[PDB]
Write a protein that binds this ligand. Sequence first.
Ligand code: MFE
Lengths: 267, 346
Amino acid sequence: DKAMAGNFWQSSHYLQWILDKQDLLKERQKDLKFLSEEEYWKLQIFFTNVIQALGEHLKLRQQVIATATVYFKRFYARYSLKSIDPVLMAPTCVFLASKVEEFGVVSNTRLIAAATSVLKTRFSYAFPKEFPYRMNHILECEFYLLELMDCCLIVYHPYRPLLQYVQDMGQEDMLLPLAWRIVNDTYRTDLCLLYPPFMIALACLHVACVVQQKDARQWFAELSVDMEKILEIIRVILKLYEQWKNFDERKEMATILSKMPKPKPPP
Amino acid sequence: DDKMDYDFKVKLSSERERVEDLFEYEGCKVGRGTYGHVYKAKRKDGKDDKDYALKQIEGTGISMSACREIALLRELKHPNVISLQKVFLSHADRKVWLLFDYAEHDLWHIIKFHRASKANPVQLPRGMVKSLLYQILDGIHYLHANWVLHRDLKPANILVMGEGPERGRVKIADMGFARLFNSPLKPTFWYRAPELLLGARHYTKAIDIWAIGCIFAELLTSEPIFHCRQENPYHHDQLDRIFNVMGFPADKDWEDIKKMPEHSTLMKDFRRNTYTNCSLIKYMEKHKVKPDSKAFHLLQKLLTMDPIKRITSEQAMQDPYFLEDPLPTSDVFAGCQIPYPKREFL
Ligand SMILES: Clc1ccc(CNc2ncnc3ccccc23)cc1
């Protein structure tokens, strides 16, 4: 789906959903009354993994999964985890993302079946009880997701730029698998809300070069990019791998999920 | 939702703009379609006085078609492509409304008007035709450069702004935003490229350009160049119409035709000899268009039978036809009075 591919600089993604980091943390302070900053990041990681699991079950391509992940991050960048249960939002985001494509269709029964199966088989350490929402809840949630995102549905990602760079390097076999994999892991962070995709891509390719002891200093020099912003992104990638080392989601997530603020019922 | 936060829910509902509070439109339906119904609408909260178009999307919820149309309209911005102003999600009926600036005219009604005057004129301002064509190509080019195809281009889909700040400006509308697998094989033919009728499996830029060629022949003559009786991608009589106008392609004209799925059926049904004295030249001469005009030579590049030999939209905008007097005007009516009636309310 090359639709709009060259248009990032006039896109709703760039003009509306590259957020200021300070606005983000300010709107985050409301859910930090129940959760520490670690616990909020661990949650973020968890639901990235939940959304990925759903995408794989439904045989969606990575870009569609990324868009779903991004819908989810946008919604909770503005609103509290209590406003809509993120167990309901994650499959809603996947479903919506997938209807932005014309190659294929995700049916209602198939969506619900995928959600039920993935939580039971792959996330029973966090969820004792079965997926409780029916398709009518999904359709309701869709409307609130669409409203909140201001109907901005086209989302750019670093995979396309990354391919262009590795092809340009003449190093696709050595570096693409790793770099691609690091790009996936960036969605465990806020980076896609804070930098344009090609900058995340460059950061990922740099880290891949360091892990494979490949000298790329001249290639990067020959670019015209704010390298300090790139270094910013590398540091977030390196730190994420330190939080990943020290994190046992399987042991911790049920407890962090119990601390999440809860929806107020009606009078 | 029982377990969606109440405060959040009532707060969003208190602030949510509803289409029926902001616009007066009931009874003012101006178009119907499988895609959805269109109303002329005026703004209640009177801080405006322009007309607007309200499209109510057919069906409920967000279908794949709706989702893609919102997603792409939301991003595209070009003077010659209809511009989404606002989306309304109505939560009670789960209906979706899209808000556009209203366009009084279109080429289906403009052409029909001039054809009516043949009973008792052929596009009066000198460069109206040229100007229309140039703007159609401009907007199609924007879409093609964003890897967006139209896929359903025809005179009714080429709107023209009336009195107002955008007077006389073309607005391409009603793109076919969802086609499963980008396929014409999945659930009139006058504007369909021959490769479609022979079973092309995918829409292409070039199929849009053929349609532009057909529209341009229709603006020069007021007749659909490939008019056909209203009788699976293969449509025999429509192919018969194309060949009576154009002639039958020689092997050299369209080498890859033999790769079309319906090529063998074409050979079964048709014989080159049937069309031996047929050509675009002869067709357009009978409609008082000169074969050595720059208009004719551009038209012939646009109606090329082999899709790979068809000119692109960018090459057509560079054509010297647009440098020859009269130049294209940003208002296709070139300051003249608009003799075309306004929209009837269906
Ligand atoms: Cl032949 C024809 C018949 C009816 C219509 C009505 N459709 C419309 N009229 C005015 N502005 C519009 C803006 C966006 C989408 C549709 C619009 C168009 C062409």
